[PDB]
Design a binder for these strands. Structure first.
Ligand SMILES: Nc1ccn([C@@H]2O[C@H](COP(=O)(O)OP(=O)(O)OP(=O)(O)O)[C@@H](O)[C@H]2O)c(=O)n1
Ligand SMILES: [Mn+2]
Length: 580
DNA sequence: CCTGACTCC
DNA sequence: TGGGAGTCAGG
């Protein structure tokens, strides 16, 4: 706890060295259009704090920020890059991101600030953010001297921690994963978040007004069927109605009371007309609260754009998550909800939305990894395995498969390969539990390689204490040797699933990097808007569609070469809804 | 603030 | 008693 630094009133030449740890501090969780409260720079010449009004209106500091040959080490550089974009400033030359480094070394640590990263190497000369800024309503930027010291201590930590973190990544064979995949991706996500997605608020509001009326009609029907008014959105009050007043069978309990999950209620549909109406009500209510109202709340009124934040250092598998708003869970399965997608439109006139999705990429990845002959065969003969399962499940022909049936058969394929039980399967399909068990048996017998892979991957996790993905991402599984059956089982199924979902995540990230480079090298105006796990969404002038119809799927397909091919479907249209 | 509901991959 | 996420209203 002893560290000298300069509290600078102006920018000097020595603050602009070609190598520096840089902190650009943004305290609000949502960094879009959020205040930069201070800057700190640490380099061979010393340690510096600058006020943002000083630094960010200085033409030399702005120049240095934007000079890719001036290298910066940071923590959460995407947060800084995006905040700086909202201030009209370009940040380049980020060569090390401690957040992403810590994330690759162990995603379970939940590293979310520099102090937490520091603890991984027993570096303790830096405070946690929460201790400096406080919590909830008490959250505040502290007095300049305290803030200055905090930002400089963070910068010093990044400075000292870079080499030890790189060394450990290197020992793990994850240095290139960080430097050639996650760090370049961070810059691409920053562009996408800043660009935002344009929303047709006129249409969304009209939808919302019509939905409110429809919701009211269903709400009354429900009260009529119940013989009484009650809060449908309280599973507690609903439970009394269904299971006490109406005396319907109790199929499941939670720790707080009776279950009213969709799975359960669907099973009660033959007992009383009220259950179907409740399900419908809860769907419509979620549309209203989340995809109409919640979405309008986050629309930037002046531009009509929404700006998601893609969390790149959160999930345990290597996936992204999307927040405020989550643009990776916009409805599609039911037509009622799918219409929400009509409100997502191109950011200018005569542009179009272009959507491309990998076909069954998880399962191709698994065919490659397991080297299963049959499954590989199905993808080398390139069939549609989900539809095939559907033909089997509903004892119907190819042309006889309805989009809902395939979706049910897709969940069954995913279920079985990832360790669903006979109980779980029998429930989902309403067959005898013996039938369910026989079906799983027939399944693994039809794909013995997948069978062997899943047995082997579990024993490997027991022995090493972690599993890996195709590009060397890691997940530690300390619970896999637990004496407790449930605990051990959950860990075992993580060993079965994480390597595949995580590998699929590795591949699409690589494709995003490849695609962006091809787009920029052709000076196309087309740019990425969103990633939805196995899908990439772009917008571009209508004139560019032809080029995109070739380039996007080709780049995606070539991102990696597996034993089986990768296949991508694509569509475009005037709205996200129409890109189908 | 947690639980359980709905949404997606 | 398949895996990974976020947001919401209610309590
Ligand atoms: N119930 C589900 C749905 C999806 N996924 C994961 O998310 C991936 C992509 O989702 P999805 O597009 O629905 O799977 P696809 O096989 O590609 O089906 P489709 O071609 O119809 O889009 C899956 O491969 C799987 O790894 C999952 O684990 N469980
Ligand atoms: Mn898909």
């Amino acid at each position: 706890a002893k560290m000298a630094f300069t509290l600078a009133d102006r920018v000097t030449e020595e603050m602009l060295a070609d190598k520096a740890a840089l902190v650009v501090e943004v305290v609000e969780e949502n960094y879009h259009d959020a205040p930069i409260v201070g800057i700190a720079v640490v380099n061979e010449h010393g340690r510096f704090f600058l006020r943002p009004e000083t630094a960010l209106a200085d033409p030399q500091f702005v120049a240095w920020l934007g000079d890719e040959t001036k290298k910066k080490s940071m923590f959460d550089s995407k947060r800084a890059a995006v905040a700086l974009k909202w201030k009209g400033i370009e940040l380049c030359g980020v060569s090390f991101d401690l957040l992403l480094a810590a994330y690759l070394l162990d995603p379970a640590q939940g590293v979310d600030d520099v102090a937490a990263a520091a603890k991984m190497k027993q570096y303790e000369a830096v405070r946690p953010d929460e201790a400096v800024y406080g919590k909830g309503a008490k959250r505040a930027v502290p007095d300049e001297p305290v803030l200055a010291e905090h930002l400089v201590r963070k910068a010093a930590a990044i400075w000292e921690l870079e080499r030890p973190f790189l060394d450990e990544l290197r020992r793990n064979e994850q240095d290139r994963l960080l430097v050639e995949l996650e760090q370049p991706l961070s810059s691409i996500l920053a562009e996408m978040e800043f660009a935002g997605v344009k929303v047709d608020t006129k249409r969304l509001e009209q939808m919302g007004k019509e939905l409110a009326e429809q919701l009211g009609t269903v709400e009354q029907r429900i009260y009529e069927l119940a013989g009484q008014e009650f809060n449908i959105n309280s599973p507690k009050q609903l439970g009394v109605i269904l299971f006490e007043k109406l005396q319907l069978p109790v199929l499941k309990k939670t720790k707080t009371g009776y279950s009213t999950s969709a799975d359960v209620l669907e099973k009660l549909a033959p007992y009383h007309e009220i259950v179907e109406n409740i399900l419908h009500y809860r769907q419509l209510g979620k549309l209203q609260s989340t995809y109409i109202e919640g979405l309008l709340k986050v629309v930037r009124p002046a531009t009509k754009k929404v700006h998601t934040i893609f969390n790149q250092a959160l999930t345990q598998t290597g996936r992204l998550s999307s927040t405020e708003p989550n643009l990776q869970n916009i409805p599609i399965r039911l037509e009622e909800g799918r219409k929400i997608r009509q409100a997502f439109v191109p950011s200018e006139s005569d542009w179009l939305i272009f959507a491309a999705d990998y076909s069954q990429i998880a399962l191709r990845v698994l065919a490659h990894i397991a080297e299963d002959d049959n499954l590989m065969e199905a993808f080398r003969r390139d069939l549609d395995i989900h539809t095939k399962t559907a033909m089997d499940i509903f004892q119907v022909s190819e042309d006889e498969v309805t989009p809902n049936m395939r979706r049910q058969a897709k969940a069954v394929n995913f279920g079985i390969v990832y360790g669903i039980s006979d109980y779980g399967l029998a429930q989902n399909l309403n067959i005898s539990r013996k039938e369910a068990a026989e079906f799983i048996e027939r399944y693994f017998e039809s794909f013995p390689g997948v069978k062997r892979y899943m047995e082997n991957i579990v024993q490997e996790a027991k022995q090493k204490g972690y599993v890996t993905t195709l590009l060397h991402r890691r997940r530690y599984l300390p619970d896999i040797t637990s004496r407790n059956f449930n605990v051990r089982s959950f860990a075992e199924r993580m060993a079965m699933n994480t390597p595949i979902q995580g590998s699929a995540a590795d591949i699409i990230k690589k494709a995003m990097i490849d695609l962006n480079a091809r787009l920029k090298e052709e000076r196309l105006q087309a740019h990425l808007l969103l990633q939805v796990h196995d899908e990439l969404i772009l917008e571009a002038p209508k004139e560019e569609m032809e080029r995109l119809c070739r380039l996007v799927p080709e780049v995606m397909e070539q991102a990696v070469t597996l034993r089986v091919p990768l296949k991508v479907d694509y569509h475009y249209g005037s709205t996200w809804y129409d890109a189908k």
